[PDB]
Structures are given as structure tokens and as C-alpha cells.
Amino acid sequence: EYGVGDLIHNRLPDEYLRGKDRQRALIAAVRHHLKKVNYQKFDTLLAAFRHYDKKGDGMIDKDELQEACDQANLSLDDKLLDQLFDYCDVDNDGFINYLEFANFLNWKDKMLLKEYEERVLLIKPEDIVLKEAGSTEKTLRTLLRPSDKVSNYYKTTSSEINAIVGYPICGVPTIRSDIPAPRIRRISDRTNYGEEGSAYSLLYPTIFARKGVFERDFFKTRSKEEIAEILCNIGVKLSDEEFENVWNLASKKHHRGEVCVENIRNVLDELR
Amino acid sequence: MRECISIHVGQAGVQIGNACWELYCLEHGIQPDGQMPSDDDSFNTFFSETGAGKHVPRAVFVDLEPTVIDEVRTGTYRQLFHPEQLITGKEDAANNYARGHYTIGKEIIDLVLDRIRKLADQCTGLQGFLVFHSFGGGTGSGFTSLLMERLSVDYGKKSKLEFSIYPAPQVSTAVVEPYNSILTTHTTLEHSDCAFMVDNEAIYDICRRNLDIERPTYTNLNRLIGQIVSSITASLRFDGALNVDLTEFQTNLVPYPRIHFPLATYAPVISAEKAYHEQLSVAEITNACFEPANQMVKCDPRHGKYMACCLLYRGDVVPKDVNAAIATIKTKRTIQFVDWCPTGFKVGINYQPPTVVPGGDLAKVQRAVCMLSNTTAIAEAWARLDHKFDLMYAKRAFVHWYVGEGMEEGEFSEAREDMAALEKDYEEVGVDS
Amino acid sequence: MRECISIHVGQAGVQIGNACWELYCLEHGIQPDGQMPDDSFNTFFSETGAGKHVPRAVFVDLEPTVIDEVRTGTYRQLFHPEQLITGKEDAANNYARGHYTIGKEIIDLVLDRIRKLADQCTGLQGFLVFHSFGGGTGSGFTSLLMERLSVDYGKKSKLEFSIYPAPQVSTAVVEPYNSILTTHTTLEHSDCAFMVDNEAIYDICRRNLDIERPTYTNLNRLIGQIVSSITASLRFDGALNVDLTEFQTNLVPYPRIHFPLATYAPVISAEKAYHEQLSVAEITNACFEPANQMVKCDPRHGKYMACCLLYRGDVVPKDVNAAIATIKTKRTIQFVDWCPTGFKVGINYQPPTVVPGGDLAKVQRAVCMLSNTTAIAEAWARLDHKFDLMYAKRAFVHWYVGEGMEEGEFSEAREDMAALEKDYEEVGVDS
Amino acid sequence: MREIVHLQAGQCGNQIGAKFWEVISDEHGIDPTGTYHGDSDLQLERINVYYNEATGGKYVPRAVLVDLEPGTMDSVRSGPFGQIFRPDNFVFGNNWAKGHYTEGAELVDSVLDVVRKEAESCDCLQGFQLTHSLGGGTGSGMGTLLISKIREEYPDRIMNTFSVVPSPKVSDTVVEPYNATLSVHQLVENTDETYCIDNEALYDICFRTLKLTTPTYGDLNHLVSATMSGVTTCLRFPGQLNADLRKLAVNMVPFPRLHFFMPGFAPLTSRGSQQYRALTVPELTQQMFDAKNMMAACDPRHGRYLTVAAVFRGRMSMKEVDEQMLNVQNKNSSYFVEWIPNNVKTAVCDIPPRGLKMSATFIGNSTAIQELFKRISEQFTAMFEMEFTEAESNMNDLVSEYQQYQD
Ligand SMILES: Nc1nc2c(ncn2[C@@H]2O[C@H](COP(=O)(O)OP(=O)(O)OP(=O)(O)O)[C@@H](O)[C@H]2O)c(=O)[nH]1
Ligand SMILES: Nc1nc2c(ncn2[C@@H]2O[C@H](COP(=O)(O)OP(=O)(O)OP(=O)(O)O)[C@@H](O)[C@H]2O)c(=O)[nH]1
Ligand SMILES: Nc1nc2c(ncn2[C@@H]2O[C@H](COP(=O)(O)OP(=O)(O)O)[C@@H](O)[C@H]2O)c(=O)[nH]1
Ligand SMILES: [Mg+2]
Ligand SMILES: [Mg+2]
């Protein structure tokens, strides 16, 4: 009922191949005989298709196939012709088209497609392919039986998994800029939050470093009256309108942590 | 100006190079088509610029079997390699040293030296060689045996740097691998300068207990080996605090001309979920190289003694943390150094952090270190291989396949006595005063 | 800069240690994910640069079903994924299985974690090993765990928290056998070991907390508050801060007498304390009261050697002096004549916190006691009688000798515990 | 690049070869007409191994069908895939004397001319494969003659013969020990790989593990042809660890007189238990080292294994395979020899067969076939002019060499 091949290849119960070898041999024999007769008689595949389609509807039917085999000197049973027709019609629309006629009833590679064949619709624009890679000659597409779809069946592991065409960082940085510096440092505290600056700065200090003003005091934000009295005591005398312009520029330079002392000095240096 | 050449021979050497060359494309941002994006002196070691802007790698892919090199020829990297550097033959070597060296290996090497001659002419400065293969295979043993003796005659005193697959003590894929390993290292002793060693069974347990990969595949193995070789040459392509040239870690790693087989160790290898929990500092990743679990060659370093080490770092590290971590190690009583090398640690620092491969199993960490160790513990590793040789040769098994091509029986006896001399050389050097 | 390493062995140690880490996370305001929404957390947590915190804990057990609820439960994200070590086929209440056959398989992995946790350490104070005497895994594995930590770490402190086998209530048949073997090896490989028993906690949960049906979830909440009180002098500031080595010296008069009894006060409900006033001079009176003792023994039968009072919260040193000097004038509370001073006081600033769903109340001040008495001589005299009756007919011995143990080590532990009994009588008599 | 020439001798060899051609044709997506139909380019990357491209993309087998009777020739021609063959490669004309001296002495000129033509038309030929049986007059007398002539003409090539071996219970001929004893004389001297097939083991595999009620001869031949395709898939399909026929031979032939091999197919399962059993590498290893999966009437528990190899098909890891081989060699330590370490060989191909996710093919070189040789010797001696005595002498030499290498 099932043989050993169905068990080996895990084939579905609808597609058991026990008891059909004789009919497969008969279908193959009639198929090859029809292909040989077509190549021996008709030099043009379109001419062969037009000879096979007597009614002129663009389709091949079962009665037309009976008449064609009678012309081609084959005595076929009705069951055999129905099975061969079902083999030929992959799309299951009840009709034999140009593509599967040229792929199952005729040699599609011996007769090269020509300009008149392309001009004469029976074919689709997707039905034309190159004959072979890097060649100007064009042929027909190869319709595939549902048994022979193997694209997901065969895949290489190494090259296809390796094929790569060219999340946040995890660990601890050397300088802990993410953690804010504590207000008072413990004697056991040793980790660098970034305030310990350059050896040049420690060796030859600027006046702020000499007198206790550092990057924290530079980057700390202040209030409006505080900046006003700082500027007034410096002696850079500004009117209220240009003071508000400087405030707006310092706010626009960086929205978060706005109007810091370095931003105000940068705005003043840019305007002057 | 500093430029190096890479040769991939056999299936094991080529298949690593598929994973190896894509890591160089990811690090420098080169597309597989062969050009940089439209939107530099760091790529000149491994790539050469053409006139149109296309970048061409310096690699020669030689194998006597067409079934593996044609996978590259039809793969996703067909638009990158030179079509004449992809050399192929027919009917392989069949795990035989006789076919890779005496009969089939002589129809190819005239074309092979033609390619190496052309790449050396385009090189402003040549620094070393990089040959990748395996000891067990016939092509990996036969073909690289006659390859140095043409190249070392052609180029006199250029460094030669292998990365070869050690046969594992327990698992093996062939039966004549004890035969093919002996005949290879008879010839590399006087023709190479440093031949690094990795094996398969040690990397399998790395993927099990660190990455939690219960089913490791050869794709996973070759990515991890590809990260070591990209970290060895990282001081030739980028800028760093302590740059290490090929010639200057050859002097520090070879104390005697016949003791030149160091082991490669990489750290840290962890998955994605452990790196969030674990805190990886400078002092821990350097102590992640010395435990008995995390050597990439199946041997016990506690039995032997270390001779010379090379700790090549990457990423955000500072030299104070490195030197303080080294002096911690020397006071530990587990690690034993020989008394005739008081200073055995060499360190290299690079500014470029490791690059994670998308879709891979390795995590991305700010820093990583590659450890190269010259140790006496691999003498017992070679003792098991000689014991594998003795029981197979005692009845002249697997010999008539070897002598049917032109090889004589007397080479087997004269290679065995070379290896007994090599094992006693490790006994001579480890005995202290 | 001061931090400790906590190991949790056995089902009793882990389930208590499960209850400990909700209390520890709520002390420092860290979610069970392990990220905060100040170096107090440095004692128990190691910070990762992403903002995460990892506890300094190693959960080890030979059963999978007791650690798999940690990997599945709401504290999955907290611990290291490979710090949770898992065995198979347990020890089945066999001291020989957890020490000779199955305990030797994983100890190399167990001590590897201790090396890696102590390398990140910059200064270590001691260990906190949680186990129980009755079980095979909690006794057999802890014995080999402790003997190799003495040869690895020279003079580092080691504090055990053991579940003492109660006189009347018990779950195991070979439970007297395990405790005799446990003491013989631990007597020379430890510094302090504090015990509680299941029987005394049951009655304290009844007459004080008004719980008619206590369960093992509620017992570990009270035990975790005691171990939170011991460590709190390291994490938080206070008037009198005690180090782990300070009361390691102050509680052990002789090298074999190192088995104190740890009790807590006040443990009462939220409805009861609303009526009562709690002061410094009255919480310590409940400490010496015999119905509040955490071990099922009679304090009046024995004489005290030394006491340690660890106050927490809003207390003043003047109130303690009136409290301590009151006790020394009383009669039946008896102190040995060779130890004139017998008290140590610890004052801390942060009051105890309450967990959600808990049964303890929010009191301004709370006190934990550590007492070293001679009363436990009868507690061991009873256990040797339980050990002798079953060993007289050689019952349950053929299971222990099947895994590698010999018949002689059952005998050799007996006179060692007999030597332990007469040591109390040697120092209990006045001179 | 590498090519194999196929030869079909005897009726049984013709049927097995026809089933082989069907199996590899629908594995490579070949229409019985001769056109290619398949979604995968890997079917057409390597088609010159077994097939020759005719004009217009038609592909024809590289096989020669040789027989002394027209009935089997007409049966193969009228079979399911019979029209694909070359109409000139059908060469036709129960006694070993008839097959080797009287009637087969004249057809071999026409046989060797076509074989030499097909060898000359090949680019770089790799080897020969011949399918026959040791118990038939035609399949022995013509088979040994063709082996001798091909080995005389082509010294440095690899040759694989697939021989159906006599059975003690299912035998249907009386001159069966005579033909076997007369054929092993040539099969021991001019052969690089012999493959033993037993129809009794085929029947027992169809009965026990697969639960067939009426096993047909075609169903017996399908299981052999599956192993025939599985042993040579590494020459046609890319793999993670490739090993061709010479790589198999160098590894698996320790001495030139020990090259008779027992094969196996390893994913076998019936329809009833297909849902109940899952298929992965460890239970594939269990099925392939299972003794009831063996292809001959030889029991591996009696003797010892010299060299065993496994070729796998499909998407699988390698660490699992290495652990499986190391573990099975460790558990069965007395069943492998001690003077040869690492008795196991692994090859893995990246392509599984038709309708299955993965597959495993077993091939073994063990001492167990010495009983298979001794039973034929004992059957021959009771029924038993100088060449018969010399053949019995060399069978005795063969079993003596097996015994002295086993012990
Ligand atoms: N790391 C790694 N090793 C491999 C890979 N493929 C093969 N090997 C190793 O290669 C060793 C034997 O060499 P072969 O695989 O036969 O390849 P070869 O060296 O070219 O020899 P031939 O195939 O006979 O030409 C095996 O033992 C494997 O360990 C791979 O993809 N990755
Ligand atoms: N206080 C307290 N004691 C517990 C708890 N769980 C178990 N115990 C005690 O543990 C004793 C027995 O130990 P087990 O819980 O079985 O664990 P173990 O010591 O490792 O012994 P095994 O299960 O055989 O491995 C019991 O007698 C209980 O008194 C708990 O949650 N809280
Ligand atoms: N597998 C298989 N074996 C067969 C078949 N037909 C015959 N045999 C075996 O072949 C042996 C007889 O060989 P025979 O046909 O006389 O060889 P010939 O005379 O050269 O054709 C018998 O023992 C059968 O077991 C078949 O269709 N399939
Ligand atoms: Mg190869
Ligand atoms: Mg338990």
C-alpha cells in the first residue's frame, strides 16, 4: 500500500507512488515520442502550437489532444490521455497553455526564440529569460512541478549563515562620567568622575585653578540677578536689552543646563 | 606602508578565512562589493586600493579540491576577491601527505608562487606571512609542507606566522591524523618562525560554559578564531599606546630556535545576558586568561611552566591598571615561571575597542585582550600524539596508501626520531638550576 | 570599603536567604530588577556601570526545584545567572552523600565563585553561611565548604546561622545523627555560629504576634531581621559602631565555647503596639525574659558568660546605662564570677524598616541580643541521649556506610561531643 | 571535474542500478524526458558527475547496461525511467563458465569499446562503480571479467562494486556456493571497495523495523539505492566536512586485502511511530549503530570493528556528532580494536535527501564478515578443478587474515 520509498521520504498519503510505475512509464514514453515528432516535423514552436490548437482559441483541450495524438500516430486510452493532460496542466485551470506546452510537450532549448516569436499575448513579459548567464540569447521560463519545489529543502549552512553585509554598551568605563560627582569625597573614594584634569593643568594652573574656581563652578547654572551682579562687578556694562539678548543666546546654545557661565562667556566672546 | 599577506590552504584554512575576511570588512567599513560608502591609512595592511576606488584584499585561496573554493566563488563575497587569486585543482588529497606534497602538489605550486610574486611587487613594505590550515588533513599537511621551502628560499628572513588546527586528544574526524601531524611538524621546525596552535575540543567547551551554546557549529568556531587573528594584527592597522610589530613579538616569544609554538587565549567571551550583570574591569579580564578552564588548547598549564607571555589589549585601557594587574599575578603561587626568565610579560595597548558581528553570539565589550603564552605544558600534548603514532606504526598499518605515490618508508622513522628529540628539548629547557 | 560574602546552602539556607534579600533591597531603595530609581550598598551590592546592582550572594544547592523558583520568580533579574549553582539527586538527608559522593562533584565550581567575588573586594570582613543541622546537604556540604575556606583564607571571619534541631518538634528521623557529625568538623573551622530552633519561633509567633497558624514564610522574616541588625553597624552610621571582628572577640571566651543565642525585641503586631509605650529601659527587660528566648532552653538553669546588646533607632546612651546597671543588681539573672563585665552595647541610627505584607510593626527603636550562656549544656546532653539510643542497635547506619563513611567516625564524634559537655561543667563551677 | 562510470551487470544489478538512476534523478530534479526541473541551483552546479549534457539541455546517464538476455533489457527499457538511457549503451547477447569463458568472451570487446569511449569523453575521470550479484552466472562471470579488464586498463583509479551476497535461507540456486567461491577470487585481488548486500537482511529490515507485509523486489532495491546515493553525495553536493571516494578509501582500508564493507541507512521509521519518534543526531546515532539496521546476515556482537564511517546529510552541528562518536566508542570499548585509535570517521554534507530534514548513512569494516565467508566455504566444500581448490585456499587465507588481525 505504501512501499518503502514513501516511508523513507515521508511522503503524504495523497502522493503514494505504489502501483503507478506502468502509467508513469507510459506517460514518459508518449511525452518523449511527441517531443521527437514535434522537433522532426515543425521548425517553429509557435507553428507547432498553432498546429496543435485547431480551434484557434489559444488553448489546448482534451479532444484536441486526442486528435493531435491520432495525427502523431499514438493509440491512447482515455484514462492515459486524461492522466497525461493532468500532468501537462500544472496550473489546474483545465487548459494547456503555451508555457507548459513548450516545457512538457516540446524541446524548448533546441529551437531558439526569434524576433517574430517575441513579436507574437500568448506569453507574459515575465516569461522571457536569458538563455544563460552573460548571453544575449533569450529563452522561455521553466515552469516547475509542485513535486520539485526544493528552495527551502536545500540551503548551505556555512556561506549563507556567514553572509553578513557591512544594543548599548555594557561594562564599566574607565572614567565614570555617568555617575554625578558627590558633594564631599570620602577618603576611601578613589574612582575618577572626570574632575581630576590634565597634568598640564596641575603643573601650571590658570588663575581659577589657583584661587579655587573649577569646572564645576563654571558649568553650574545660576539665576538672573546673580548673573547680573556678576557682570556688574566685572565691569562689562550692558543694557537690559542686550543682557536679555545674551541670556537668550546662552539659553539657545544648550537647552538643558542653560545659561551657565561658560555659555555666557562664549556668547559674549562671539558678540565681541 | 606596513603590509602583510594571508594565504588560506585546505578546507579548514579557507573556511576560517570566510569568517576572517568579513571581520576586516566590518572593522574598516568596506562593503562586500568592494568600496567604501559615499558618506585613511588603517586598511592598507590587508587591502589595496584600485584606481576606480574599489578595494581588493591581499589573500590567496589555494585548494586542490574545487568543492570548497567554488562556494566562495558563488557566495556573497564573489565581488571582492581577485578572480586569479582563487586557485583550484581537482581530486583533492584524500587525507594523504603523499598527494599534497609529491604527486598532485607539484601541478599547482608553479602558479602559486606566481601570485605571491605579484603581491610582493605591489607591497611598499612586507612584514610577515599568515598561512591558515589544519594538521589532520592531507591538503593542510601536504601542501603547506612544500610551500615554505619554496617561499623561504624566495624570501630569506621574512616572518612566517601560522594559525593551525591541533588534533584534539579525544575527538577526531579521521583515522590517519596521527600520521599527517607528524610529517607536517618535521618540516615546520626549520622553516617557520612562530606557529600558533588551536584545537577543536577546547573551543567546544568554551561555547558550552561561557556562551551557553549547547550545539556549537563550525560557523561559531571560525568567528571566535577570526577575532583572535584580528586582534593579533590590530597593532598594525590602528594607533595605540604600545604598538607591537610582527618582528618585535617574534624576538620576545622565541627564546630558542626549536621552541616556537605558543598558545592563543582570548578574553572575555560571554553572552549578552551575562555582560549586564558582570562588571568587566582591567584586572578581571587579565585574570580571565589564566584559569585552567579558559585555554583554547586542551592542556593543563599547571603541570608546566610559562616561558614568555604577550598580553595584547584593545579598547579603553590605561597602562597603570595593566602593570598593577601583572604584579598581582607574579605573586600568585599557582602560576609558575621558569627562573631563567625573570621578566616574561610583554603588553600591547590599542585604542580600538572590539567590533561585534551582527547576528553573532559574542557580546560587545569596551575592552578585550588576546593572550599568547609560550609554555612547557604542550610537551605532554605532543606525548599523546607520539603515543598515537607508535600503536599505528607498530604493524605498518595505513602505509601502502602512502608508498604508492612515491614516498619512501624511511621518512616515517626519521620523522619520529625528530619528535623524540623535540620532546626532550622541552625536558632540557625546563630543568632549572 | 567594608563588605561581606554571603553563601546560602540547603533548602533552609536558601529560603531564609530568599527572605533576606527583599529586606536588603528595601533598606537601600532598589527595585527587584536591580536598578536604583552614598556608599551604604557597598557592603552587599556591586554596582555595574549601567546602573544595575548585583548582590554578593552565591545560592548553591543540590536540588533543581529550589533554585528554579528563583530563576522563575520576581527576583530573576537581580542575581548573576551563573551564581545560582544547581546539582542533581540532592543528598537525601545523608551526611555521607553530601560530603563524600555528591558534594565533591560541585565544590570546585562553588569555590570558584568565592575566588571571583573576593577579587572584586578591596577589603573583606567575613562570610555569612546559612545552613541547618538537620539536613544532609545543609550539614554535609557545609562541612567540606568550611574546611577548605580555612586553608584558603587564613584569619577571615566566618559566621554561621544554623537552624537548631528542636527538642520536641522534628521532621527527620536521622536528624540526631546529622547534628553530631556536623559539630565534630565545624568546631575547628569557624569563628561564630548563631542558632535558632523551630519550636521557640512557633510560640513567639503565637503569644506575641497573635498568629494562630505560623508558616515557614513568616519565620524567615524574623530571622532576616536579626541578620539585618548585625550588619547594620557596617552600612549605616551610629553612635557606637561594632565591626564583625569586634564581637567575634567579645563573645567567645574559650576556643570551643562559640555557640551564642540570638534573640530579638520587640516583636509585636501593629494593633498591639499602638496601645503600648516602647522605651529603651523596657525593651532590654524583654530580652532577658525567658519566654522571648529564640532557642528552646531554660535561661534560669544556666549562668551567663557574656552578652551583646545591639540597639537600633532612636536610643540614647544614658538610657542604656540605667538599663544595664539595673540588671546587674538583680538576683536570679546570674553572671559568672570570673566575668565581672558581661555586656557590650551597640547604638545605631537608622530604625528597622517594614516589608509590604509583613506582620511586624513599625517601632521607633529595636534591639537584637547575642547571649552566651551555660544553659545549652542540657540541650546537648539531650541530643547525645537521642544519638545513643538509635546507635545502640546500629540503626540507619548501613545507609551512611554505603557512600564511603566508615563505622568508626560515628563513635569518634561521640566522645568529642562528650568532651564538649564536660567543658561547660569545667568552666561553669565557680572558683 | 570528477566523474564516475556506471556499469550494470546481471538482472539484479540491472534492477538496483535502475532504481539508483531514479533516486538520483529525482534528487537532482531531472524529468524522465531529460529536462531539468528544480528551484535550487545546487542541482545543476554538479551534474557532470553522473550525467552528460546532450544537445538542447537533455541529460543522459553515464552507464553501460550489459546482459546476455533481451528480457531484462526490455524490462529496464520499459521501466519507469528507462527512456533516459543512451540507446547505444544497451549491450545484450546460469553458468559462470558461460559468463566468463564461452558466451561472455565475445561481448566484452563491444563492452570495453563503449566503456573506453565514455572514459575518453570524460575530462578528469575519478572512478568506476559496478552493480551485480555474486550468485548469478552472468553477474559473476561477466562481472569479474569486466573488473579484471578495467583494472588492467586503468591502474590508478578508484573502483566500487555493489555485490548482492548469498544468503543461507533465501537462496534459490544450487550452484550458488560455486559461483560465490569462483567470484571472490577476482573480487579479492582487483578491487578497492566491495559492498556486501544480503536479501535476507533486506527482508528482516522490511519486516521488523519498517513493518512491511508484502515487500516487493523494487522495495528491496530502493533501500540499497538510498545507501548508494548516500555514500557518494559528497562528490555532488557541498558539505561542511567533505570526503570523496579516495578519502573514504585511504581512511578505511588498513590492509589491501580487507576492503569488504557493510553499509547502512539510518533514518528508517514506519508510518505508525513517525509522530511518536523525534529525529535528531543522538537517536540517528542509535539507529545507525543498532545491529538490526545492518545490511548483511552478520552479527556485530560476535566480532570486532576495525574502521567505521558515517556520512550525514542535512543541517546539523558538529560538536554533537563528535560527542556522539566519542561517547559510543567509550561505551563500546571492547567492540573496537586497541591497536588502532579513533576507529570512527565523520563526514557531514549540507544537503539532506528528498522529503526529510536529515539522514545518516553507515559504512563499516569489521571482522564479522568472516562468518559470512566461512559459511560459503563450508557450503562449497560439502558440494565439492584446480581453480576451485585455489579459490578455497584464498578464502581460507582471507578468513585466517581476519582471525589473526582480530586476535
Ligand atoms: N575550525 C575548523 N576546523 C575545520 C573546519 N573544517 C575542517 N576542519 C578541521 O580539518 C581537519 C581535517 O582537515 P580536512 O577537513 O580534511 O581539510 P583538509 O586539511 O583540506 O584535508 P582534505 O579535505 O583531505 O583536502 C578536521 O580534523 C577538522 O578539525 C572548519 O570549518 N573549522
Ligand atoms: N527557619 C526555617 N527553617 C527551615 C525552612 N525550611 C526548612 N527548614 C529547616 O530545614 C530542616 C531540614 O533541612 P531541609 O529544608 O530539608 O534542607 P537541607 O538541610 O539541605 O536537607 P535536604 O533537603 O535533605 O537537602 C527542617 O527540619 C527545617 O527545620 C525555612 O524556610 N525556615
Ligand atoms: N534486491 C534484489 N535482488 C534480486 C532481484 N532479483 C534477483 N535477486 C537476487 O539475485 C539472486 C539470483 O541472481 P541472478 O538473477 O540469477 O543473477 P544473473 O543470472 O546474473 O541475472 C537471488 O539470490 C536473488 O536474491 C531483485 O529484483 N532485487
Ligand atoms: Mg578538503
Ligand atoms: Mg534539600
Coordinates of N, CA and C in Angstrom, one line a residue, chain A residues 26-27 30-31 33-35 37-38 48-57 59-90 94-98 100-102 104-106:
Chain A
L26 N 4.4 4.9 -19.3 CA 3.6 5.2 -20.5 C 3.5 6.7 -20.7
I27 N 3.4 7.5 -19.7 CA 3.3 8.9 -19.9 C 4.7 9.4 -20.4
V30 N 5.1 8.4 -24.2 CA 4.3 9.2 -25.1 C 4.8 10.7 -25.1
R31 N 5.3 11.2 -24.0 CA 5.8 12.5 -23.9 C 7.1 12.6 -24.8
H33 N 7.9 10.7 -27.3 CA 7.6 10.5 -28.7 C 7.0 11.7 -29.3
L34 N 6.1 12.4 -28.5 CA 5.5 13.7 -29.0 C 6.6 14.8 -29.2
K35 N 7.6 14.8 -28.3 CA 8.7 15.8 -28.4 C 9.5 15.5 -29.6
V37 N 8.5 13.9 -32.4 CA 7.7 14.2 -33.6 C 7.7 15.7 -33.8
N38 N 7.5 16.5 -32.8 CA 7.4 17.9 -32.9 C 8.7 18.5 -33.4
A48 N 4.2 24.9 -34.3 CA 3.7 23.6 -33.7 C 2.5 23.8 -32.8
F49 N 2.5 24.9 -32.0 CA 1.4 25.3 -31.1 C 0.2 25.6 -31.9
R50 N 0.3 26.3 -33.1 CA -0.8 26.6 -33.9 C -1.4 25.4 -34.6
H51 N -0.5 24.4 -34.9 CA -1.0 23.2 -35.5 C -1.7 22.4 -34.4
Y52 N -1.3 22.4 -33.2 CA -2.0 21.7 -32.1 C -3.3 22.3 -31.8
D53 N -3.4 23.6 -31.8 CA -4.6 24.3 -31.5 C -5.4 24.5 -32.8
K54 N -6.3 23.6 -33.0 CA -7.1 23.7 -34.3 C -8.2 24.7 -34.2
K55 N -8.8 24.8 -33.0 CA -9.9 25.8 -32.8 C -9.5 27.2 -32.8
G56 N -8.2 27.5 -32.5 CA -7.7 28.8 -32.5 C -8.0 29.6 -31.3
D57 N -8.4 29.0 -30.2 CA -8.7 29.8 -29.0 C -7.5 30.1 -28.1
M59 N -5.8 27.9 -26.5 CA -5.8 26.8 -25.5 C -5.8 25.5 -26.2
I60 N -5.3 24.5 -25.5 CA -5.4 23.1 -25.9 C -6.3 22.3 -25.0
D61 N -7.2 21.5 -25.6 CA -8.2 20.8 -24.9 C -8.0 19.3 -25.0
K62 N -8.8 18.5 -24.3 CA -8.6 17.0 -24.3 C -8.9 16.4 -25.7
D63 N -10.0 16.9 -26.3 CA -10.3 16.4 -27.7 C -9.3 16.8 -28.7
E64 N -8.8 18.0 -28.6 CA -7.7 18.5 -29.4 C -6.4 17.6 -29.2
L65 N -6.2 17.2 -28.0 CA -5.0 16.4 -27.7 C -5.2 15.0 -28.2
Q66 N -6.4 14.5 -28.2 CA -6.8 13.2 -28.8 C -6.5 13.2 -30.3
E67 N -7.0 14.3 -31.0 CA -6.8 14.5 -32.4 C -5.3 14.6 -32.7
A68 N -4.6 15.4 -31.9 CA -3.1 15.5 -32.1 C -2.4 14.2 -32.0
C69 N -2.7 13.4 -31.0 CA -2.1 12.1 -30.9 C -2.5 11.2 -32.0
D70 N -3.7 11.2 -32.5 CA -4.1 10.5 -33.6 C -3.3 10.9 -34.9
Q71 N -3.1 12.2 -35.1 CA -2.2 12.6 -36.1 C -0.8 12.1 -36.0
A72 N -0.3 12.2 -34.7 CA 1.1 11.8 -34.4 C 1.2 10.3 -34.2
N73 N 0.2 9.5 -34.6 CA 0.2 8.0 -34.7 C 0.5 7.4 -33.3
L74 N -0.4 7.8 -32.3 CA -0.4 7.2 -31.0 C -1.8 6.8 -30.6
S75 N -2.0 5.5 -30.2 CA -3.3 5.0 -29.8 C -3.3 5.0 -28.3
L76 N -4.0 5.9 -27.7 CA -4.0 6.1 -26.3 C -5.4 5.8 -25.7
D77 N -5.4 5.2 -24.5 CA -6.6 5.0 -23.7 C -7.1 6.4 -23.2
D78 N -8.4 6.4 -22.9 CA -9.0 7.7 -22.3 C -8.4 8.0 -21.0
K79 N -8.2 7.0 -20.1 CA -7.5 7.2 -18.8 C -6.1 7.7 -19.0
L80 N -5.4 7.2 -20.0 CA -4.0 7.6 -20.2 C -3.9 9.0 -20.7
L81 N -4.9 9.4 -21.6 CA -4.9 10.8 -22.1 C -5.3 11.8 -21.0
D82 N -6.2 11.4 -20.1 CA -6.6 12.2 -19.0 C -5.5 12.4 -18.0
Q83 N -4.7 11.3 -17.7 CA -3.6 11.4 -16.8 C -2.5 12.3 -17.4
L84 N -2.2 12.2 -18.7 CA -1.2 13.0 -19.4 C -1.6 14.4 -19.4
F85 N -2.9 14.7 -19.6 CA -3.4 16.1 -19.6 C -3.3 16.7 -18.2
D86 N -3.6 15.9 -17.2 CA -3.4 16.4 -15.8 C -1.9 16.6 -15.5
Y87 N -1.0 15.8 -16.1 CA 0.4 16.0 -15.9 C 0.8 17.3 -16.6
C88 N 0.3 17.6 -17.8 CA 0.6 18.8 -18.6 C 0.1 20.0 -17.9
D89 N -1.1 20.0 -17.4 CA -1.7 21.2 -16.8 C -1.4 21.3 -15.4
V90 N -0.3 22.1 -15.1 CA 0.2 22.3 -13.7 C -0.8 23.3 -13.0
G94 N -7.7 23.6 -16.3 CA -8.3 22.8 -17.3 C -7.8 23.0 -18.7
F95 N -6.8 23.8 -18.9 CA -6.3 24.2 -20.2 C -4.8 24.1 -20.3
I96 N -4.3 23.7 -21.5 CA -2.8 23.7 -21.7 C -2.4 25.0 -22.4
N97 N -1.5 25.7 -21.7 CA -1.0 27.0 -22.2 C 0.3 26.8 -23.0
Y98 N 0.7 27.9 -23.5 CA 2.0 28.0 -24.3 C 3.2 27.6 -23.5
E100 N 3.6 25.6 -20.6 CA 3.7 24.2 -20.2 C 3.6 23.3 -21.5
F101 N 3.0 23.8 -22.6 CA 3.2 23.1 -23.8 C 4.6 23.1 -24.3
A102 N 5.3 24.2 -24.2 CA 6.7 24.3 -24.7 C 7.6 23.6 -23.7
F104 N 6.6 20.8 -21.5 CA 6.3 19.4 -21.3 C 6.0 18.7 -22.6
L105 N 5.7 19.3 -23.7 CA 5.4 18.6 -25.0 C 6.4 18.9 -26.1
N106 N 7.4 19.7 -25.8 CA 8.3 20.1 -26.9 C 9.6 20.5 -26.3

